[PDB]
Symmetry: D2
Subunit: 344 residues, 4 copies
C-alpha cells in the first residue's frame, strides 16, 4: 500500500502551530509532502504591510522547512508551489488545483489524503483535488497562534516562533562606544538581565592590544576576517535571541577602526555594512573618569551619519547611570517603538 499525505501553506512565517500539525499528519503516514505556496504580489503585500525589517525569500522559507524537518527529510518532503495569476483564495481552486496537479507530476508523487484546519477546504479538496481530508485542531486548542499575529507583533508571540525564523523577527541592538570596555560589560549585563543573548566584539583581544602600542596587532588585511567572525557571533545571538540581541560593536566600528589606522577604507567592510543593518544602534559618550579617543567617536558619527544610520546617542556621568539610560530605551523596544534619537 503505502499511505501518502500533502499539506499546503504560505508559512509566512512558520510557527510551532504549523510545526506541531505537520508532525501530527506525519504520524498518520509513511510519507508526507509539504508544499510551501508563494504569490509574488500577495507575499509582497504581507511583508510591507507588516513591520518586518528584511523580507523572507521563497528560498528563506523553503529552507526553514527544509531545516525544521531535516532529521525526517527521508519521508517528509518540501516543495514550492507558485500561485501567481491564480485568483484570490476563496475561489480559484479550479485554477489552483491545476498547478497542484502539475506539481504532483513533475515531482512524481500522488498523495491520497490532505491535512489542514480551515474546514472550509474539505469539500473543495474533495471536489477539485479529490482527496480524503482530515481536520486537525481548528479550534487552535493547542498553539493558539497565527502567521498574522506573529507577523504583526512578534514579541507577544515569541514562544511560537521556531528558531529558524527568529532572524526575521528578532531585533538587534548594537552598542558603539570607546574602548571604555564598560561597553562589553554593559552589553553582557543587558543580555543577562533580559534573559537573552549577546554577540561580543570579535577579536577584542587584539583591539585592546593595538590601541595599546602594538601597531601590528591588528592590520588592514585582518579586518575582513574579524568582521566575518563578528558575524558568526551575531548569528548565534539571533538564532538564540529571546526577542532582542545585544551586539557589542557593529561593522561600522570596524570600518572606523580600519580608516583611523590605515587612512583607507576597505570595500569588504563596506559591503558588510550594507548587508547587515541593525535594528537599533546606540552610541555611548563619556567624559568623566584626553587622548585620541574623541577622534574615534568623531569618526564614528561621521561614518554613522553617512550610510544613513539612524542612531541614538547617549551621554552619561557614571556607569550605573548609563546602564539605566540604555535599559530604558530597550524597554521601549520590547514594547513601544519609534525612537530615532529617542524620546530622550
Amino acid at each position: 500500500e503505502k499511505k501518502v499525505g500533502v499539506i499546503f501553506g504560505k508559512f509566512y512565517p512558520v510557527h510551532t502551530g504549523h510545526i506541531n500539525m505537520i508532525y501530527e499528519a506525519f504520524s498518520k503516514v509513511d510519507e508526507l509532502h509539504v508544499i510551501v505556496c508563494s504569490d509574488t504580489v500577495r507575499d509582497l503585500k504581507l511583508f510591507y504591510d507588516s513591520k518586518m525589517k528584511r523580507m523572507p525569500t521563497v528560498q528563506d522559507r523553503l529552507r526553514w522547512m527544509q531545516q525544521i524537518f531535516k532529521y525526517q527529510k527521508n519521508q517528509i518532503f518540501i516543495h514550492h508551489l507558485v500561485e501567481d495569476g491564480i485568483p484570490s483564495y476563496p475561489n480559484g481552486w479550479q485554477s489552483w488545483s491545476e498547478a497542484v496537479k502539475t506539481l504532483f507530476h513533475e515531482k512524481h508523487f500522488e498523495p491520497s489524503i490532505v491535512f489542514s484546519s480551515e474546514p472550509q477546504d474539505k469539500a473543495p479538496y474533495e471536489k477539485y483535488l479529490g482527496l480524503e481530508v482530515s481536520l486537525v485542531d481548528p479550534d487552535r486548542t493547542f498553539f493558539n497562534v497565527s502567521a498574522t499575529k506573529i507577523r504583526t507583533t512578534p514579541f507577544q508571540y515569541w514562544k511560537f516562533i521556531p528558531k529558524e525564523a527568529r532572524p526575521f523577527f528578532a531585533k538587534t541592538v548594537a552598542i558603539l562606544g570607546g574602548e571604555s570596555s564598560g561597553k562589553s560589560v554593559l552589553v553582557n549585563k543587558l543580555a543577562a538581565v533580559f534573559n537573552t543573548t549577546s554577540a561580543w566584539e570579535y577579536g577584542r583581544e587584539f583591539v585592546f592590544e593595538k590601541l595599546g602600542g602594538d601597531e601590528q596587532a591588528m592590520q588592514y588585511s585582518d579586518y575582513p576576517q574579524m568582521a566575518l567572525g563578528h558575524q558568526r557571533y551575531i548569528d548565534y545571538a539571533v538564532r538564540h535571541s529571546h526577542k532582542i540581541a545585544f551586539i557589542d560593536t557593529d561593522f561600522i566600528t570596524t570600518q572606523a577602526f580600519c580608516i583611523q589606522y590605515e587612512g583607507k577604507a576597505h570595500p569588504f567592510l563596506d559591503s558588510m555594512i550594507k548587508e547587515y543593518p541593525f535594528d537599533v544602534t546606540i552610541l555611548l559618550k563619556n567624559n568623566t573618569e584626553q587622548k585620541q579617543r574623541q577622534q574615534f567617536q568623531q569618526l564614528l558619527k561621521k561614518l554613522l551619519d553617512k550610510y544613513k544610520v539612524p542612531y541614538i546617542e547617549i551621554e552619561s556621568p557614571s556607569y550605573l547611570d548609563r546602564y539605566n539610560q540604555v535599559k530604558a530605551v530597550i524597554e521601549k523596544v520590547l514594547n513601544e517603538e519609534e525612537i530615532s534619537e529617542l524620546q530622550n
Copy 2:
C-alpha cells in the same frame, strides 16, 4: 603593577546573580581568583534540607565555574577552599582567614582586593585578611535572587539558573508505552506545548525495524550503544530544558527490550538504570484501535516494580484523551507535587 581580586562563595548553586557579579569584579581587574568554599557537613545539610534529587559534588560545583568562565580561564581562576572544623560563618574569620592565607600560598597568588555583597564582611575582610573591599549590588537591584530561593523552589526562579546547573534542578519525565508511536508524538507535542525539550528514543528506527520481522535489526551487543546514545539525548534535553524534559523511553524500556529478545539481561543496561534515575516515570496503557505487546507491558511493570521505580500508570481510550491525562500530571509537576500513582 597588576591589580588582582578574590571572591568567596558556596555557589550552591550558581545563579546569574553570582555570575553577573563575577564579571563586574572582573572588569575591575587584570586577574580575578574565584574561590568555591565547601563544608562537608554544612553542604550536606543544605542538600538534604532541599528537595534536590542528586547532590552536586565539590567537583560538580568547581566544574560549573570552570565552565561558565572558560573563555576567560586565562585570567579568572577557580579554587576550592575547605572550611571543615572552622566555626560557623558569623565568627571564625581568624580560623577561616588562616586557610584562605594557606590557599594564597600553595596556590601562589596574592589578591589585594575582595568583591562581594554582604557589607558585614568589609571590616572583617579588612581586619583578618586586610584587603580593600567593594560592595556590588547588595540591594539585589539586578538579579533579585538567592541560592536558597533556587534551592527551595527551582521553577519559580528558573531564569536565574545557568544551564551548567540545570541538571541538578530540572525534572525529567520518562514515558513508557508500546510501539504505539503515539508515545513519541505525544512526547514531542508535550515539549512543544510546554516550550521545552525532549529526548527521543535512540535508535527508534531499528526498534521499529525489529518488532517487525528483522530479528537482526537490534541484537544483544547493540543495546549498550543504544542506551548510551539515548543518554546523549537526555543530557541535551536537560542542559536545555525549560523546567522539565520529556524523555521518550527510559533505560528500563531498553533492558526490557533486551530480555524479551535474548532471555538475558545485560549488566550494562542494569548499570545505566541505577545511574540515571528519572524524576517522574509515566506508563501508558492502551486497548482500542492482540499480539505480544501485552507481554512487553507485563514485562515493563515487572522490571519497573523491581528497581523500586515509583510510577504512575495511565489508561486511556483515545489519543486526545491520553494527551489531557498526561498534560494534567505534568501541570502538577510544574507546581504542585507528591504524586506516586497520582491523585488520579
Copy 3:
C-alpha cells in the same frame, strides 16, 4: 518517469571503493536504493576468520551506510536483506531474487536498473530480477581495494576505510602509570610522532588536585561521569585515528583510583571495563627521580590481573629511554604482532 536504481553488498566493511561507486550510480538516478545483505553464518565466518577484535553487527553496518549517506538520505535509501537458507552465491539467485522481490514489496519500491561490478551478475540480474545492469569500474582502476584485503590487513589499506568504520579496524593503546605525568606527555608525543590521535585522561585536573590534599576533589559519585567523558575522548580519537589511538589512562585506572579512595569498587566502572576492552595495554614502571604510589601500581596489576587483561609492563630509568621502549612496541603493532609481555 523517475529513474530508480538498486545496489547489493555485504559491506563487510565499507570502503571508499563502494562509496565512490554508490555516488556514481546516484548521479545516474533520481532515487537510489542501497541493500545491505547479511548472512548470519557467512558473516560470522568472515569475522572469526579475520583478526578483528569486535564484530560489526547488522545494525553497526546499516548505520555506517545510514551515516555515510546522511546528507542524501532523502534520495538514497538503505535496506537490510536477510539471505539465510539461501544457497551460496554462485547459485541461488532463484531463491535469492525471491527475497529481493519480497523486499521491493514490503518496502514499496521498484527499481529498474542495478549497479555493480562483477560482470558475472548482469545476465543473472537480467535473468531472475530482469533489470538493466551497468558495470562500473570492475578493473578497480580507481580504488584498488577490497573488503577482504581490509578485513585481513587493515593498516595496509587504511586510506580506504571510511571514518565510520575505523572503530572496527583501529587499535587502541592504553598507557597506565603513576601521576608521573610523563605518561600524558609521552601519550601525546607518541600520537604526534605517529601523526595520529590521543585521548587524554578525563578530569586529569582533579586527579592531580586529589592525589594532592583535596580529598573532595574527586569522590565516589564522580567516577561514573569521569569514565563516560574519558569514553567521549577515546571515541574521537578512534573516529580520527590514523591506525592507532593512544589513550592516556584506561577504565581500570579509574576503578583502581576509586577503590584506593573509598575501599569500594563501583559496578558502573566495572561495566565500562567489560564493555570497552583495549587492543594493547602498556604498563609504565619508574624508580628514579617513596610514597603511596607503589601501592597504586600494586593495585593496578591486581585489577589488571583480574579481568584477564593481557598487558606488557615497561620498566625504565629515564624519560628518553621509556620513550624508545614504548615507540618500539608500537612499531611492532603497526606491522608485526603477537606481543603479550612482548618480545622484550
Copy 4:
C-alpha cells in the same frame, strides 16, 4: 615557589616540531610564556622569498598559537615581541634583551628558565637575560622539520604542518562548469581518490531548482548568504585538506549566476571574489550527450577574464576522459607547477 619558563620563536609557520617542544617545556613548569617575535622587514622578506599565496599576519600567527594551546590557555601564555631596528640575529642581544625585558614588565611576568634548541643561545641567554637554559632535541631526532623547509615546499612536509596553518599552505582547486553535475561528482571523486577534502556548491539544491522553472528558487538577495555558506564549506575543506582542496564552484560562478538572472552584479559577491582567490581554477567545457548554457560558459569566461583570473580550460568528449585530463593537472600541482593554460 612556582617555576616559570619562556620560549622565543618566529613561528613562520608553526610546525609539529615547535608544538612538541612547547609541550615538553610545559611539563617542566607550572606556567609557560610563549613569545611570537616579528620583524616587519625580515618577515616580509621570508614571505616574498617563498611561494606562499597570502602572507600570515602577526595576528594570524598569534592566533595559531592562541588556538593550538587553547585548552591550556590558563598556564601557557602567548605574547608578541617586536624586533624592528634591533640588529640581525647573530648579534643584537643587548638590543634584543632590552625589549624582552620591557615585555616582561609591561606584561608582568618574570621567567627564570628558557627553552630552545640552537645551543648557541645558552650562554647569550645566560649572558644578557641571565636565565637557566635547557636544550631539547637539537638533533631534530623527533620532528625532522623546519620553518624553512615547510615554507619552501609545503607538500613534502605536510605531516608537520598543524591544521591551524594549513590555510596558508594548502591549495584550492575550483572547478567551473555547467549544471552538468558531472562537475560535483568529479569534484567529489577527485577528493576521494586523493584522500583529501572537497567543498560542495552551497545551495546546489536550489540552483538545480532554478535553472529549472522556479524563477523564485534563487533570487538576488539570496546570493550573499549562498556565497557565505560556500565559504563555510571551503574553510572546512582547507582546515582539513590533505594538500589540496577541491572546490565545486567558485564565487565568480555565483556572481555569474546572479548577473544572468537579474542583469545586475551585486557588490557583495564582488567583494568575496577579491577576498578569496583560488590557487587553481579549472574550466570544464562539454559538447556531447543546445540551450542557454553556452551563454553561461560565455559569461563565465567574460567574468573570469576580468578580475584577471588565471584559468585553464578543459574540453572533453566523455566523462572518463575529463576525469583523466583533470587528474593530470592536479598531479602536476602535487609536485610540478607553473601551469596557466597548462602544458596542455
